[PDB]
Design an enzyme around this catalytic site. Structure first.
Site, PDB file in Angstrom:
ATOM      1  N   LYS A  15       1.054  -1.045   0.010  1.00 16.93           N
ATOM      2  CA  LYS A  15      -0.125  -0.167  -0.119  1.00 16.93           C
ATOM      3  C   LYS A  15       0.998   1.393  -0.071  1.00 16.93           C
ATOM      4  O   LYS A  15       2.007   1.119   0.565  1.00 16.93           O
ATOM      5  CB  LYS A  15      -0.977   0.137   1.148  1.00 16.93           C
ATOM      6  N   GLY A  16       0.476   2.411  -0.635  1.00 17.85           N
ATOM      7  CA  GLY A  16       1.199   3.784  -0.483  1.00 17.85           C
ATOM      8  C   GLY A  16       0.493   4.617  -1.435  1.00 17.85           C
ATOM      9  O   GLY A  16      -0.580   4.350  -1.721  1.00 17.85           O
ATOM     10  N   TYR A  18       0.758   5.365  -4.453  1.00 15.41           N
ATOM     11  CA  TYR A  18       0.428   4.705  -5.779  1.00 15.41           C
ATOM     12  C   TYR A  18      -0.937   3.930  -5.897  1.00 15.41           C
ATOM     13  O   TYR A  18      -1.497   3.684  -7.029  1.00 15.41           O
ATOM     14  CB  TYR A  18       1.453   3.749  -6.342  1.00 15.41           C
ATOM     15  N   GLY A  19      -1.491   3.590  -4.785  1.00 15.87           N
ATOM     16  CA  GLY A  19      -2.547   2.639  -4.598  1.00 15.87           C
ATOM     17  C   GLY A  19      -2.037   1.352  -3.641  1.00 15.87           C
ATOM     18  O   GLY A  19      -1.738   1.400  -2.660  1.00 15.87           O
ATOM     19  N   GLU A  20      -2.463   0.165  -4.261  1.00 12.44           N
ATOM     20  CA  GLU A  20      -1.988  -1.096  -3.623  1.00 12.44           C
ATOM     21  C   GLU A  20      -1.541  -2.133  -4.496  1.00 12.44           C
ATOM     22  O   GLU A  20      -2.177  -1.929  -5.723  1.00 12.44           O
ATOM     23  CB  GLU A  20      -3.435  -1.533  -2.903  1.00 12.44           C
ATOM     24  N   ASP A 129      12.159   5.973 -12.810  1.00 11.96           N
ATOM     25  CA  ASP A 129      11.789   5.630 -11.534  1.00 11.96           C
ATOM     26  C   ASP A 129      12.361   4.624 -10.718  1.00 11.96           C
ATOM     27  O   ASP A 129      11.764   3.940  -9.933  1.00 11.96           O
ATOM     28  CB  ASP A 129      10.209   5.783 -11.375  1.00 11.96           C
TER      29      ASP A 129
END
Ligand code: LU8
Ligand code: LU8
Ligand code: LU8
Ligand code: LU8
Lengths: 279, 284
Positions: A15-16, A18-20, A129
């Site tokens: 989770k973060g 960015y979403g999951e 990234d």
């Protein structure tokens, strides 16, 4: 004919912002499912557009299965790598010459494949990234590069891994090679994170993230710009590396990824060559 | 339940295929794009990422194993098919005719108009309006389909796009202001005018109806080329003929005036989708 679209979500593995990411199941097989946050919607569109242009297939690139928009949920579906991220693996595992070189050579292979234009084929791609959390460990001891959410075909990314020209906004934005050189900067840092965990003469370092000793957690742009651009600091090479021929070669390599002048940095192709001549 | 069953192929062509399918016991439409049309799939997916008269979105999927990629668009299914199909074997009365053309005007006005707030939408030019890109609902209203060439404004580069038979004169002579969003809305009105004409022809008045014909059926060869259309629209300055029998009927007299105001060579002279919705709202 039936189109089996039932993907079962079994456990959340990340989770973060960015979403999951979820370990899931499609027709027996394990898949990884990334559910994009609204914050990161643009990343789904960038990555889907990239894969709609070129269907990347490489042992050292996380394997694409599907991009799904449902009525709006945005999903990316990939191969699942149960060993998890290089970041996770380096916390709890030390390496020997063979496992260290297998890891860094597989990352360089994946990155050189992204960077190279193949005619016939693929466009050249910059990742933008690259970091140890965006690399996964495979059971055969190689890695694969993940997360093409910021990728460009021919600022943004994780602040801790940003090249000095990004942090001081001198990057030539209209030059594709600029984004390749930003990737080599971050590759050099990943090489440093891995080398630290390779044992030599009974000695190993702790897992630490790059610049762990000069910036706080979640460093600000200003924190990073002062360390990297103004002071021109670089990660420490411990003395014990110079007693090991492999770590001595890797130290020389990471320095040649870290020049303040982008055009002076090694290319992915040159790093791949150098790494095959090491042991 | 995400299991999609493909039951029958309702359409094949340069675009790919469309299929009637089942999904949670409901009928769905499943477009499988051709590799020719992969940019249209992505464009339509961005558009739908944002109404009773726009084909309703369910899902969009890119799937790949090895070097093979499938692009899917899943929408609501409309049993009665395309307006094009419906106008073939059906005649209309005043009530059916106006409901169809008011519904299309409503959809196109909705597409064309920017709404604000966290629940809103940008402005959209469709750029591929034709009777095959409109579907007939059981309530006798229509929905606009195929946002694969659509353009948003709060660009869309490449060439000279759409169905040749429906291309505006500024598209055929390629004098269109490529950087101008209003140009694209004006291309839509041209095409909408041709669709009004196709539909009006099928409305009975005083015991008379014309059979189904596509725009310019009489003046260009079958399967007309870009050049064929340029010649009739741009060089000959031709417009679809208004049957004299329409002038005996008040509704068809009003529709004839409306379609003339969609067909000016001057794009800026053409009515807006909104004016057309309002005029059509006043007709009864
Ligand atoms: C839409 O969505 C998802 C679909 C699937 C999926 C399941 N079975 C079969 C398929 C399939 C692939 C390819 C063809 C070809 C056959 C040859 N023909 C000439 C062209 C087409 C047909 C069928 C797919 C794509 C999996 C998914 O997840 C992993 C999906 O995402 C939820
Ligand atoms: C970086 O980016 C993406 C990565 C992945 C992905 C693929 N395989 C495995 C993983 C994973 C599994 C497990 C752990 C941990 C947690 C469980 N515990 C037992 C220790 C290990 C970590 C990581 C991931 C995160 C998928 C993505 O997309 C669907 C990614 O985005 C492109
Ligand atoms: C997206 O992902 C997965 C998909 C599938 C899958 C399921 N049905 C059919 C297919 C298929 C069949 C045939 C062709 C080709 C044959 C040659 N030519 C004629 C063009 C068409 C392509 C595709 C696939 C690839 C299986 C998977 O795993 C077992 C997938 O991975 C989860
Ligand atoms: C234009 O565009 C799209 C349309 C649709 C769509 C939705 N409902 C119904 C249809 C349909 C059903 C059946 C017929 C039949 C009628 C009788 N028969 C003898 C000939 C033909 C025609 C049409 C379609 C084609 C879906 C799309 O995508 C999933 C479209 O693309 C965006």
């Amino acid at each position: 004919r039936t189109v089996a679209r039932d993907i079962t979500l079994l456990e959340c593995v990340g989770k973060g912002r960015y979403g999951e990411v979820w370990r899931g199941s499609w027709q027996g097989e394990n898949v990884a499912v990334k559910i994009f946050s609204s914050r990161d919607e643009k990343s789904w569109f960038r990555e889907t557009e990239l894969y709609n242009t070129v269907m990347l297939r490489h042992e050292n690139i996380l394997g694409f299965i599907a991009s799904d928009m449902t009525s709006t949920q945005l999903w990316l579906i990939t191969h699942y790598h149960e060993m998890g991220s290089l970041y996770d693996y380096l916390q709890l595992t030390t390496l020997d010459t063979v496992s260290c070189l297998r890891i860094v050579l597989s990352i360089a292979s994946g990155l050189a494949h992204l960077h190279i234009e193949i005619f016939g084929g693929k466009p050249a791609i910059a990742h933008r990234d690259l970091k140890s959390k965006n690399i996964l460990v495979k059971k055969n001891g190689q890695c694969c590069i993940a997360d093409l959410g910021l990728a460009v075909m021919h600022r943004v990314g994780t602040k801790r891994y940003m090249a000095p020209e990004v942090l001081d906004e001198t990057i030539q934005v209209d030059c594709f090679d600029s984004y390749k050189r930003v990737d080599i900067w971050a590759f050099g840092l990943v090489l440093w994170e891995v080398a630290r965990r390779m044992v030599s003469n009974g000695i190993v370092e702790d897992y630490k993230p790059p610049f762990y000793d000069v910036v706080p957690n979640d460093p600000s742009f200003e924190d990073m710009r002062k360390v990297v651009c103004v002071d021109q600091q670089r990660p420490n090479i411990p003395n014990r590396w110079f007693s090991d021929p492999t770590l001595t070669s890797l130290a020389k390599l990471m320095k040649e990824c870290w020049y303040q002048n982008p055009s002076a940095r090694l290319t992915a192709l040159r790093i791949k060559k150098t790494l095959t001549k090491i042991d």
